[PDB]
């Protein structure tokens, strides 16, 4: 059984909705701005504590979903209107609603509902909610603790809320694999349709982890950009010589996957086929990839092997590259190993879109899969922002895209790597 | 491709190791004891705050892994060996080591290592570490924030630590589906072997969430047992008329899944075949199952369809039943709906082992899958503990097992349900 994409939905730092996000991405816009006190998510703390906490943050830049009741904005009054709904849940529901309406898949019949599942994972959940609860322990105010505390911090709950809203009674699932979360969630859902567990899967990733402890935590891991705090629009620079860590972003990407014959029967429009889901492990380090990028090589090779395609048949690669000194170079090295002559001749088009969106963490793999599907659909490959001085590994030919380029994209591959050395590679093709 | 089980490993409130856990389970033992101040995991808090917090907890019972350097005990010096290892990670590695040495699978060859993956999920991760970090905000001591904070709290990191320990470079994965986590992780891994993503998968679940905020959070939701604080060994009573909520437990279950031909070629000892992986969603309520238990019915029916077996061919069912008023009754109705004449004849053996182990949350689905496999392997069906007065739903010979029944077990099914209405049913058979 073959698996196709019939609906796209997203909410990103470039806007709410596929149209707005894609338009701004191609136009070369950037969703990164400087942090403020409000961004700490510390409404339950006094101003002196807020001020102190802000000062402890090495990284003072982030990529935010725009909130509001106007076009291209995320309306919290519509999507975060319940006590059990944390921000990551609202993003996923918002994106899922767009994807399902795009796919024209809102079944009323129990037969179809039972054959529709959900696989939308989150990477970390809601740290800010756990911080608020922990404050109750410190201040001896535990009576205030919400009965909805547990339900709103569980990383599988986006799938729960989506399935509930639409009555979807197929597999209720979530893959959680750090920054590969959105990729594995989509991939696992594909395997389920292939095996026959479902005919339709609403799959993707979500994350809303811009808050005091998240920023402080990633800053302590030395994972975040710090030296561009006065110039936020230049903070995320994948493949650039002056990159100094990623910029935390937030949002959700959700797609509607469905079995090919099922899609054709109902006359659904098809974006692309999902042809490869390559998985590997680095088996190296909790946070650092290996020098040779073997894990990334394995993941890409496995996705290729599944599709029955040769390296030279790949038109576009959306790289994971998060704007990290070691990470970006390792992936570049891995892309050279997998594609060799196809890459070193300049034939292969590749870019990282994280200069524009930031690192969406658990949602990164899903959002970037959407970008890859859209590359095929529109015949436009997105640029990498802020590559003023390309990494020494690159030359005149082997070079990431620095402008949005029109081209036939019949095949698009998207890499997502996470802490623990967990790797996924999703390969899409026109059908 | 067929998938078989070649290794078992576990760390539970009934002991470290399969040997001790199974022996104590079958002997009708219980791992539940009363909560103390030390169990709050509040080492960074003063005595006054410890006492306040303890007084605020309505549930004062939990099921603990026995620590120590003696047989049947968890040696924390061996497994909690670095600052990056939270308890859930340590339990998983301990369980994985046992499972792999049982499977006799410690390959040196890059080929075999690349064909071996890991799918061990955690449900919540490490709340206590987030609480400690949040305390640094309240006390303005963020200087002391651990560099390993982020790696410690991520629910996928058990898979990461296991893979790097043994150099496994196959799919590095985690399904996180609340209290179905262990089941979906095992089921997902099965699909991966079935498809050809891997030849061997180290799969299961892990949890260590006995701490101040976890107990407070679950207590506030009214999910936990409160009436039996004076008699802890009586607190978990699945299917009993006096049940009043579940008892939080901790531990890990890990199994080695293997492609059938791969197992036979190397002369591996085979416990059972995994024949069915049924998945569904309630699409009803964030925490409560629907009255008719349609989700449970669907999950069980789906696992049956996949196996090619009919209800009458099922020998043992390990119920999810957690000792909650609504939950247990709903599953009882669902079992009756699926098995009808096979249930009411008294020939279907079914029990919940949560009276003995407590609710292991993310590890529940994996530990109970192991019990289902061991039932087949040993020809003994485990009892339900503390059924003094069976629920009115049970009539005549439709009754859960209240003693360890010696019997031929050819087939065994295990149910796991989680918050968000996520349901999994795993079906094993002799081979
Ligand atoms: K990517
Ligand atoms: K079970």
UniProtKB/Swiss-Prot annotation, chains A, B:
Domain of life where this protein originates: Eukaryota
UniProt record, GO biological process: fatty acid biosynthetic process; thylakoid membrane organization
Presence of keyword Transit peptide: yes
Catalytic reaction annotation: a fatty acyl-[ACP] + malonyl-[ACP] + H(+) = a 3-oxoacyl-[ACP] + holo-[ACP] + CO2; butanoyl-[ACP] + malonyl-[ACP] + H(+) = 3-oxohexanoyl-[ACP] + holo-[ACP] + CO2; hexanoyl-[ACP] + malonyl-[ACP] + H(+) = 3-oxooctanoyl-[ACP] + holo-[ACP] + CO2; octanoyl-[ACP] + malonyl-[ACP] + H(+) = 3-oxodecanoyl-[ACP] + holo-[ACP] + CO2
Pfam families per record: ketoacyl-synt, Ketoacyl-synt_C
Chief location: mitochondrion
GO CC annotations, alphabetized: mitochondrion
Phenotype on disruption: Slow growth and bleached leaf phenotype when grown under ambient air, but normal growth under CO(2)-enriched air. Thicker leaves due to enlarged mesophyll cells when grown in ambient air and associated with altered thylakoid membrane assembly and starch granule ultrastructure; these phenotypes are partly reversed when grown in 1 percent CO(2) atmosphere.
InterPro entries assigned: 3-oxoacyl-ACP_synth-2 (IPR017568), Beta-ketoacyl_synthase (IPR000794), Ketoacyl_synth_AS (IPR018201), Ketoacyl_synth_C (IPR014031), Ketoacyl_synth_N (IPR014030), PKS_Beta-ketoAc_synthase_dom (IPR020841), Thiolase-like (IPR016039)
Compartments, record wording: Mitochondrion
Tissue-specific expression: Expressed at the same level in leaves, roots, siliques and flowers.
EC nos: 2.3.1.41
Activity control: Inhibited by cerulenin.
Record-annotated Ketosynthase family 3 (KS3) domain positions: 1-430
UniProt keyword annotation of Acyltransferase present: yes
Enzyme class: transferase
Pathway(s) the chain acts in: Lipid metabolism; fatty acid biosynthesis
Subunit and interaction comment: Homodimer.
Other known facts: Mitochondrial protein lipoylation in leaves does not exclusively depend on the lipoate biosynthesis by KAS and may occur independently of this pathway in roots.
PANTHER family assigned: 3-OXOACYL-[ACYL-CARRIER-PROTEIN] SYNTHASE, MITOCHONDRIAL, POLYKETIDE SYNTHASE-RELATED
Family, per entry: Belongs to the thiolase-like superfamily. Beta-ketoacyl-ACP synthases family.
Descriptive protein name: 3-oxoacyl-[acyl-carrier-protein] synthase, mitochondrial
Organism: Arabidopsis thaliana (Mouse-ear cress)
């Amino acid at each position: 059984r073959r698996v196709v994409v019939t609906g796209l939905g997203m909410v990103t730092p470039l806007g709410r909705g596929v149209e707005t996000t894609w338009r701004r991405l191609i136009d070369g816009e950037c969703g990164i701005r400087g942090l403020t006190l409000d961004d700490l998510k510390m409404k339950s703390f006094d101003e002196e504590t807020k001020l102190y906490t802000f000062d402890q943050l090495s990284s003072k830049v982030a990529a935010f979903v725009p909130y509001g009741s106007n076009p291209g904005e995320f309306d919290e009054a519509l999507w975060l209107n319940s006590k059990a709904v944390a921000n990551f849940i609202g993003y996923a529901v918002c994106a899922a609603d767009e994807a399902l309406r795009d796919a024209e898949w809102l079944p009323t019949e129990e037969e179809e509902k039972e054959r529709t599942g959900v696989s939308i994972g989150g990477g970390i959940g809601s740290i800010c909610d756990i911080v608020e609860a922990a404050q109750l322990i410190c201040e001896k105010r535990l009576r205030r603790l919400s009965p909805f505390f547990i339900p709103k911090i569980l990383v599988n709950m986006a799938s729960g809320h989506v399935s509930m809203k639409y009555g979807f009674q197929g597999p209720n699932h979530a893959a959680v694999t750090a920054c590969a979360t959105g990729a594995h969630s989509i991939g696992d859902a594909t395997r389920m349709i292939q095996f026959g567990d479902a005919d339709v899967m609403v799959a993707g990733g979500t994350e809303s982890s811009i808050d005091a402890l998240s920023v402080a935590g990633f800053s302590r891991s030395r994972a975040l950009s710090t030296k561009f705090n006065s110039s936020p629009q230049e903070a995320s620079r994948p493949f650039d010589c002056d990159r100094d860590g990623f910029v935390i972003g937030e949002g959700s990407g959700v797609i509607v996957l469905e079995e090919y014959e099922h899609a054709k029967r109902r006359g659904a429009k098809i974006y692309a086929e999902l042809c490869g889901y390559g998985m590997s492990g680095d088996a190296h380090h909790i946070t650092q990839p290996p020098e040779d990028g073997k894990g990334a090589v394995l993941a890409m090779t496995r996705a290729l092997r599944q599709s029955g395609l040769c390296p030279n048949q790949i038109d576009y690669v959306n790289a994971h590259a998060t704007s990290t000194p070691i990470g970006d170079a390792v992936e570049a090295r891995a892309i050279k190993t997998v594609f060799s002559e196809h890459a070193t001749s300049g034939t292969l088009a590749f870019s990282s879109t994280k200069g524009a969106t930031g690192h969406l963490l658990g949602a990164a793999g899903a959002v970037e899969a959407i970008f890859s599907i859209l590359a095929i659909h529109h015949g436009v490959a997105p640029m990498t922002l802020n590559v003023k001085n390309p990494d020494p590994i690159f030359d005149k030919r082997f070079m990431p895209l620095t402008t949005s380029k029109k081209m036939l994209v019949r095949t698009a591959m998207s890499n997502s790597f996470g802490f623990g050395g967990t790797n996924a590679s999703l390969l899409f093709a026109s059908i």
